[PDB]
Protein backbone atom coordinates (compact mmCIF):
# COMPACT_ATOMS: atom_id res chain seq x y z
CA UNK A 1 0.00 0.00 0.00
CA UNK A 2 0.95 3.66 -0.24
CA UNK A 3 1.14 3.84 3.56
CA UNK A 4 3.55 0.91 3.87
CA UNK A 5 5.87 2.35 1.20
CA UNK A 6 5.55 5.65 3.08
CA UNK A 7 6.78 3.95 6.26
CA UNK A 8 9.87 2.62 4.47
CA UNK A 9 10.58 6.07 3.07
CA UNK A 10 10.05 7.71 6.48
CA UNK A 11 12.59 5.42 8.13
CA UNK A 12 15.23 6.29 5.52
CA UNK A 13 14.69 10.07 5.45
CA UNK A 14 17.30 12.18 7.20
CA UNK A 15 17.70 15.91 7.58
CA UNK A 16 20.51 17.43 5.54
CA UNK A 17 22.38 20.48 6.80
CA UNK A 18 25.43 22.48 5.86
CA UNK A 19 27.76 24.51 8.02
CA UNK A 20 31.21 26.02 8.20
CA UNK A 21 33.73 24.20 10.39
CA UNK A 22 33.07 25.33 14.01
CA UNK A 23 29.87 27.17 12.98
CA UNK A 24 26.09 26.81 13.20
CA UNK A 25 24.36 24.18 11.06
CA UNK A 26 21.87 25.41 8.48
CA UNK A 27 19.25 22.66 8.12
CA UNK A 28 18.19 22.80 4.48
CA UNK A 29 16.02 19.85 3.42
CA UNK A 30 15.69 16.06 3.44
CA UNK A 31 17.95 13.36 2.01
CA UNK A 32 16.77 9.81 1.38
CA UNK A 33 18.94 6.80 2.20
CA UNK A 34 18.56 4.18 -0.55
CA UNK A 35 21.17 1.45 0.09
CA UNK A 36 24.32 0.94 2.19
CA UNK A 37 25.77 4.43 2.83
CA UNK A 38 24.23 6.02 -0.28
CA UNK A 39 21.57 8.73 -0.22
CA UNK A 40 19.63 10.71 -2.79
CA UNK A 41 19.79 14.45 -2.21
CA UNK A 42 19.04 17.52 -4.36
CA UNK A 43 22.46 18.99 -5.15
CA UNK A 44 20.93 22.48 -5.20
CA UNK A 45 21.10 22.16 -1.39
CA UNK A 46 24.84 22.91 -1.52
CA UNK A 47 26.40 23.21 -5.00
CA UNK A 48 25.63 26.88 -5.69
CA UNK A 49 27.22 28.31 -2.56
CA UNK A 50 30.87 29.43 -2.40
CA UNK A 51 33.51 26.83 -1.43
CA UNK A 52 31.03 24.01 -0.71
CA UNK A 53 33.81 21.42 -0.36
CA UNK A 54 35.26 23.25 2.63
CA UNK A 55 31.91 23.06 4.43
CA UNK A 56 30.73 20.35 6.79
CA UNK A 57 27.69 18.32 5.80
CA UNK A 58 25.33 17.16 8.54
CA UNK A 59 22.89 14.30 8.59
CA UNK A 60 20.26 14.18 11.32
CA UNK A 61 18.89 10.70 11.81
CA UNK A 62 16.12 11.07 14.39
CA UNK A 63 18.16 13.26 16.76
CA UNK A 64 21.45 11.44 16.25
CA UNK A 65 23.78 13.59 14.18
CA UNK A 66 26.44 12.54 11.69
CA UNK A 67 28.80 14.99 10.10
CA UNK A 68 31.50 14.84 7.48
CA UNK A 69 33.63 17.15 5.41
CA UNK A 70 31.94 17.85 2.10
CA UNK A 71 35.24 16.79 0.46
CA UNK A 72 34.78 13.29 1.91
CA UNK A 73 31.35 12.47 0.47
CA UNK A 74 31.33 10.82 -2.96
CA UNK A 75 28.83 12.38 -5.36
CA UNK A 76 27.55 10.33 -8.33
CA UNK A 77 25.23 11.52 -11.10
CA UNK A 78 21.88 9.84 -11.85
CA UNK A 79 22.32 10.29 -15.61
CA UNK A 80 24.07 12.54 -18.14
CA UNK A 81 23.63 16.29 -17.64
CA UNK A 82 22.29 18.17 -14.64
CA UNK A 83 19.52 16.35 -12.81
CA UNK A 84 19.76 18.20 -9.45
CA UNK A 85 19.23 15.04 -7.44
CA UNK A 86 22.49 13.14 -6.99
CA UNK A 87 23.64 9.96 -5.28
CA UNK A 88 25.87 10.73 -2.28
CA UNK A 89 28.02 8.23 -0.39
CA UNK A 90 28.47 9.24 3.26
CA UNK A 91 31.02 6.97 4.98
CA UNK A 92 29.97 8.06 8.49
CA UNK A 93 26.25 7.33 8.11
CA UNK A 94 24.76 4.11 9.51
CA UNK A 95 23.84 1.61 6.76
CA UNK A 96 20.35 2.10 5.33
CA UNK A 97 17.70 -0.49 4.61
CA UNK A 98 17.95 -1.16 0.85
CA UNK A 99 14.82 0.41 -0.65
CA UNK A 100 16.07 0.51 -4.26
CA UNK A 101 13.69 -2.28 -5.37
CA UNK A 102 10.74 -0.08 -4.38
CA UNK A 103 11.61 2.53 -6.99
CA UNK A 104 9.80 2.54 -10.32
CA UNK A 105 11.36 0.76 -13.31
CA UNK A 106 11.89 3.05 -16.32
CA UNK A 107 9.56 0.86 -18.42
CA UNK A 108 6.73 1.23 -15.87
CA UNK A 109 6.71 5.06 -15.87
CA UNK A 110 3.51 5.28 -18.00
CA UNK A 111 1.67 3.31 -15.30
CA UNK A 112 2.04 6.16 -12.78
CA UNK A 113 0.77 8.90 -15.14
CA UNK A 114 -2.75 10.34 -14.66
CA UNK A 115 -2.97 8.83 -11.17
CA UNK A 116 -2.72 10.32 -7.70
CA UNK A 117 0.46 10.15 -5.68
CA UNK A 118 1.67 11.00 -2.20
CA UNK A 119 4.72 13.03 -1.32
CA UNK A 120 6.30 11.40 1.68
CA UNK A 121 8.52 14.01 3.25
CA UNK A 122 9.28 16.07 6.35
CA UNK A 123 9.68 19.65 7.34
CA UNK A 124 12.83 19.53 9.51
CA UNK A 125 12.07 16.01 10.60
CA UNK A 126 8.33 16.26 11.18
CA UNK A 127 6.81 13.66 8.84
CA UNK A 128 4.13 14.73 6.39
CA UNK A 129 2.02 13.06 3.72
CA UNK A 130 1.20 15.49 0.93
CA UNK A 131 -1.48 14.58 -1.60
CA UNK A 132 -0.58 15.17 -5.24
CA UNK A 133 -3.18 15.30 -8.00
CA UNK A 134 -3.05 13.17 -11.13
CA UNK A 135 0.54 13.11 -12.30
CA UNK A 136 2.03 14.30 -15.53
CA UNK A 137 5.60 13.99 -16.79
CA UNK A 138 7.45 17.05 -18.08
CA UNK A 139 10.34 16.14 -20.34
CA UNK A 140 12.08 19.29 -19.09
CA UNK A 141 11.21 21.17 -15.89
CA UNK A 142 12.61 24.55 -14.83
CA UNK A 143 12.52 26.08 -11.34
CA UNK A 144 14.09 28.95 -9.42
CA UNK A 145 16.49 28.33 -6.56
CA UNK A 146 17.06 31.13 -4.06
CA UNK A 147 20.59 31.08 -2.69
CA UNK A 148 21.61 32.21 0.81
CA UNK A 149 22.56 35.74 -0.31
CA UNK A 150 19.23 36.30 -2.08
CA UNK A 151 20.32 35.92 -5.72
CA UNK A 152 18.58 33.30 -7.85
CA UNK A 153 19.50 30.59 -10.34
CA UNK A 154 17.26 28.87 -12.88
CA UNK A 155 17.58 25.09 -12.76
CA UNK A 156 16.43 22.73 -15.51
CA UNK A 157 16.14 18.95 -15.22
CA UNK A 158 15.03 16.11 -17.48
CA UNK A 159 11.96 14.00 -16.69
CA UNK A 160 10.19 15.52 -13.73
CA UNK A 161 6.79 14.59 -12.38
CA UNK A 162 4.28 17.40 -11.97
CA UNK A 163 1.24 17.17 -9.73
CA UNK A 164 -1.25 19.56 -8.17
CA UNK A 165 -0.51 20.08 -4.50
CA UNK A 166 0.59 22.32 -1.68
CA UNK A 167 4.18 22.19 -0.47
CA UNK A 168 6.37 24.06 1.98
CA UNK A 169 10.02 25.05 2.28
CA UNK A 170 12.05 22.12 3.55
CA UNK A 171 10.05 19.38 1.81
CA UNK A 172 12.67 18.90 -0.92
CA UNK A 173 14.37 15.51 -0.80
CA UNK A 174 11.14 13.73 0.16
CA UNK A 175 9.94 10.81 -1.99
CA UNK A 176 6.98 10.79 -4.38
CA UNK A 177 4.99 7.53 -4.05
CA UNK A 178 2.48 6.34 -6.64
CA UNK A 179 -1.11 5.51 -5.63
CA UNK A 180 -0.97 2.71 -8.21
CA UNK A 181 -1.04 -0.58 -6.32
CA UNK A 182 -0.47 -2.58 -9.50
CA UNK A 183 3.11 -1.26 -9.58
CA UNK A 184 3.34 -1.82 -5.80
CA UNK A 185 2.96 1.90 -5.07
CA UNK A 186 6.40 2.53 -6.53
CA UNK A 187 8.63 5.36 -5.40
CA UNK A 188 8.66 7.69 -8.43
CA UNK A 189 11.37 10.16 -7.52
CA UNK A 190 12.48 12.98 -5.29
CA UNK A 191 10.74 16.27 -4.57
CA UNK A 192 12.72 19.27 -5.88
CA UNK A 193 10.37 22.24 -6.37
CA UNK A 194 6.92 23.68 -5.80
CA UNK A 195 4.89 26.79 -6.48
CA UNK A 196 1.51 27.97 -7.77
CA UNK A 197 -0.11 24.82 -6.30
CA UNK A 198 2.15 22.49 -8.28
CA UNK A 199 4.74 20.04 -6.99
CA UNK A 200 7.75 18.84 -8.96
CA UNK A 201 9.76 15.66 -8.40
CA UNK A 202 12.77 14.46 -10.38
CA UNK A 203 12.15 10.99 -11.82
CA UNK A 204 14.38 8.38 -10.21
CA UNK A 205 14.20 4.86 -11.60
CA UNK A 206 15.60 1.54 -10.40
CA UNK A 207 17.99 1.57 -13.34
CA UNK A 208 19.63 4.78 -12.11
CA UNK A 209 21.05 2.96 -9.07
CA UNK A 210 23.34 1.08 -11.48
CA UNK A 211 25.50 4.22 -11.24
CA UNK A 212 26.52 2.56 -7.92
Amino acid sequence: STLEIAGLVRKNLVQFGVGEKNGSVRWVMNALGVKDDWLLVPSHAYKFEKDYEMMEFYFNRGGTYYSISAGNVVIQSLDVGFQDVVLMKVPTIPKFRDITQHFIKKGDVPRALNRLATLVTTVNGTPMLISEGPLKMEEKATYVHKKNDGTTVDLTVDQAWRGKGEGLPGMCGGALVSSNQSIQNAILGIHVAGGNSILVAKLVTQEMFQNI
Binding site: A141, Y143, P169, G170, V192, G194, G195, N196, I198
Partner: peptide
Protein backbone atom coordinates in the same frame (compact mmCIF):
# COMPACT_ATOMS: atom_id res chain seq x y z
CA UNK B 1 8.20 27.08 -9.43
CA UNK B 2 10.72 27.55 -6.61
CA UNK B 3 13.25 25.04 -5.27
CA UNK B 4 11.68 23.63 -2.13
Amino acid sequence: LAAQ
